[PDB]
């Protein structure tokens, strides 16, 4: 999604909620560092997933 | 400033990060109950009671 924290809420609403084992993650095509990984890494690892 | 600064801290709405560098430095002399609450610009305290 465009915006940081509405990335965050839905990964795992959609991801997690389907038994993933692991998760891929791509920098996104606008030229903005570290947006799309943060969120991910802060979500998944609380199970650490 | 006299005032308060309320800054865009609407969640769903927008994002900003830029302004929030200049908000340790007013945690560097906070003491309360004979004791020092002083925050190092890390984030933790520099001489606690332990």
């Given at each position: 999604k465009p915006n940081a924290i509405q990335m965050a809420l839905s990964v795992c609403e959609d991801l997690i909620s389907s038994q993933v084992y692991a998760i891929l993650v791509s920098h996104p095509?606008?030229?903005?560092?570290?947006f799309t990984p943060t969120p991910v890494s802060y979500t998944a690892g609380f199970y650490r997933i | 400033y006299g005032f308060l600064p309320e800054l865009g801290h609407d969640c769903r709405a927008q994002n900003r990060t830029?302004?929030?560098?200049?908000?340790?430095?007013?945690?560097?002399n906070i003491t309360w109950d004979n004791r020092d609450y002083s925050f190092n610009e890390d984030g933790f305290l520099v001489n606690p009671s332990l």
């Open positions: 095509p606008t030229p903005n560092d570290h | 830029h302004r929030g560098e200049s908000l340790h430095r007013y945690f560097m």
